[PDB]
Structure 1
Amino acid sequence: VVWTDFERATIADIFSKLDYEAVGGATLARCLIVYPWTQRYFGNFGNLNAAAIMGNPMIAKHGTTILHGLDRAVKNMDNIKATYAELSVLHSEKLHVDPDNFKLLSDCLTIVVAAQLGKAFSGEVQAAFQKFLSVVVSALGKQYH
């Protein structure tokens, strides 16, 4: 991946405006409600009903964890694959997460961020955010190289 200056500035800019607990919690809840089969991968997280998912403290926590995971890539934009080496193993060999779900979660995060940032989330800005998520999702999936 070759990042442009605009892209690096925009990605750091976006994440500096996101409360990881709020956005992460919201993003994960959104995924589990819009794509409810995604709940099966969290079968050990308790009471999951939309209000139940909205109120679940484990989901709030795990949502925060995801945003912190993404922060690792923001702080290492030229070395995302290596940074995510153990996460990629975890989500494949251990958790057997079908890779489409990474796209589902990414699209939820994008909608959450678009709602927060409003007019500021222009086509150009979304283009940079999506390049970033594509690199992240490629690094999170099973690695064949």
Structure 2
Amino acid sequence: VEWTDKERSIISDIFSHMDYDDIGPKALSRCLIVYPWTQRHFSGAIIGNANVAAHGIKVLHGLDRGVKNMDNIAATYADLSTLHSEKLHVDPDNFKLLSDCITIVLAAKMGHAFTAETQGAFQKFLAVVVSALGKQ
């Protein structure tokens, strides 16, 4: 993918002011409430469950890993891809759904700072990261 310096700045800015313990859990809770069928991947109220909060955090950290390697993104996730694919049995579609939830939770955090230009950069980044994850 092609990145502009502006996009590098924006994504870096967002992830350096993000609070993982807050955004992480909220973004996963929302996905499990809005798209109930994803729940089958946590077979053991949803907003208070510590195991959910835990993977929510892991997800954001997994993304942070991509923010540092914006140029070598496919390789960076190859392993995590197999994890979700071959072993956890995740439907590739579920990644795109979580993607939207993360965007919505972030927008409610940054409020008026989540300008259209910021949305553009953040979504393009999640896109590349979702393809990589649903490719192996």
TM range, normalised to the smaller chain? over 0.9
Alignment gaps of 5+ in structure 2: none
Q: Does 1:121 align with 2:114?
A: yes
Report the CA distance between 1:75 and its aligned residue.
Answer: 1.0
Find the aligned partners of 2:97 and 2:59 in 1 and give their Cα distance.
Answer: 14
The one-letter code sitting in structure 1 at the alignment partner of 2:67 is V
What are the residue-to-residue correspondences of 1:57-96 with 2, within 5 Å? Answer: 57-96=50-89
What is the aligned residue count?
136
**CA distance in 2 between partners of 1:28 and 1:133 (Å):** 15
Deviation per CA, 1:67-122: give whole Å up to 9, x if none.
00000001111011111011111111111211111010000000000000011111
C-alpha separation in 1, matches of 2:78 and 2:42 = 21
Measured after TM superposition, the shift of residue 142 of structure 1 is 2.6
| Identical counterparts, % of pairs | 72
1:90 and 1:34 map into 2 onto residues whose CA distance is 24
TM-score using structure 2 length? 0.97
Structure 2 residue 6 is matched with structure 1 residue 6: yes
Question: Counterpart in 2 of 1:19?
Answer: 19
For 1:19 and 1:124, the matched residues in 2 are separated by 21
Structure 1 vs Structure 2 CA RMSD = 0.8
> What amino acid sits opposite 1:89 in the alignment?
T
Identify unmatched segments of 5+ residues in structure 1. 47-51
Q: After TM superposition, what 4+ stretches of structure 1 lie above 3 angstroms from structure 2?
A: none
Once residues 121 and 103 of structure 2 are traced to their aligned partners in structure 1, the CA distance between those partners, rounded to angstroms, is 11
